[PDB]
Design a binder for this molecule. Sequence first.
Ligand SMILES: Nc1ncnc2c1ncn2[C@@H]1O[C@H](COP(=O)(O)OP(=O)(O)NP(=O)(O)O)[C@@H](O)[C@H]1O
Lengths: 388, 146
Amino acid sequence: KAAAVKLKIENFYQSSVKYAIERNERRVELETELTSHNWSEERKSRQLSSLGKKESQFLRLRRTRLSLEDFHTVKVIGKGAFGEVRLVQKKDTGKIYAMKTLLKSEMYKKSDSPWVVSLYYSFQDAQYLYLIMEFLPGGDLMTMLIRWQLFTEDVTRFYMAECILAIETIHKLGFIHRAIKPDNILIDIRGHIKLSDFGLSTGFHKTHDSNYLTMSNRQQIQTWRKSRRLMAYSTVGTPDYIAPEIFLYQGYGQECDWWSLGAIMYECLIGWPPFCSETPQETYRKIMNFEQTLQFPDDIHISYEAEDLIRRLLTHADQRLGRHGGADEIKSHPFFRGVDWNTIRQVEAPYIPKLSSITDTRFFPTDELENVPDSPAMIGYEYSRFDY
Amino acid sequence: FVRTALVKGSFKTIVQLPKYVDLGEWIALNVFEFFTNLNQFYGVVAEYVIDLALTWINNKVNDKNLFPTKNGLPFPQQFSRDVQRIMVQMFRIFAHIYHHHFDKIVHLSLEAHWNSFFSHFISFAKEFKIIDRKEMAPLLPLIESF
Ligand SMILES: Nc1ncnc2c1ncn2[C@@H]1O[C@H](COP(=O)(O)OP(=O)(O)NP(=O)(O)O)[C@@H](O)[C@H]1O
């Protein structure tokens, strides 16, 4: 509250010193690139052979230019509120592709391995992010679980397992998914398992939903339990698995994913997740309990060992006394006669998908939904090495 | 007027066309950068007081025929001609900016950044000889420091 004299200058467009400090990188970067052009002289000198004109030639490469509409859309595949995934063809080349149209704002939270869905690149318009993925043809698992509610035995064993090994490898690669949910597990050509990823698709469940003569007419537990598959989703995301380490405070870790697994196993045998609520918030509820509220029906058929899994799978995420300690011991459960833990990847699959042609969407609720409370309504190559 | 010489880097290497590449693809790359480069440069200077040619530059580079965006498609070698012209689209901007509008720029004291950038554009030109030493009349003396 005294007085001051800077003085001369102001700052007007003074924010474009970015244009100064930034093109630093442009040079810093420009430096290290053509030093990567020194990748030449690979020269395996075990070779006394030709000669014979040139050992090589190149285009070499190019960043060219890019955008959407080099893409021809096939079918709406599936959805999230972040957006629709989709099947698409490249116009420019053309081939089979998973397009997940995802959302840029408004959105929060601001390889060498067979086991998951393989993405390639990302491209976007103003509005949406476009995720261009290997398109996994067998459907999600959920769409399988729907067509038939698996009678399993060796099948849920099979559909599981490779779960673990993948998830193992993931975990082993130092990642927890915290989404293990059927629409998000993926069946391939072989009917085998790659599980994809969140993208990252975020938003999450808290804090507590508290509302506060008769009749009847439910007439069966399972009947009652048919109330699922309710408007596809079209709000979501439900807590199928949702190991109970997430809420309230910080937590989780691999145990959540195995929980999520065991929970998943529970359904795929039972044709419904352990905690199925009839309302979004009737989980947490029983999920905050299990114990007494982890509940198997009196439809009798189960293994002693298989039952043992899910329970110790759905037992606490508890550390301290215990190991868990999983992904093996999870290999070491009595529920497993085999397998090799190896041959698994090529083993006659419980369903080898049978298709007419390459585009067949017969494995999906192609359907139509089209609700995206966003749209008014109304690219680049910076990558490095080559493919492939 | 004007002014010069603070610094970034050394020395001059990068501009030469690397081996076994369609020079055209190679040409086509680099030419496009410099475009966007000045764009971002003028944008501090912007207002406070080419669209065609930059777009004629744009439209040149966004001509598929002259511009083998796609693959290892070679360039027409009139693409090698399309570019010799397309380049010269560029020097117009530098000079005047430097001639007249540098004034502002130096106030920014971001000068060591525009210096290397302007110096840059040169090195490619004369190593690849994309221009004549006669049309150099307006920019002649400054270059002479080296
Ligand atoms: N890489 C993929 N390949 C094939 N199908 C996929 C792929 N990713 C997701 N899907 C399927 O398309 C639907 C939606 O994409 P998805 O990633 O699952 O949605 P989202 O916006 O991530 N969140 P959510 O839809 O609830 O899982 C899924 O239910 C699956 O059927």
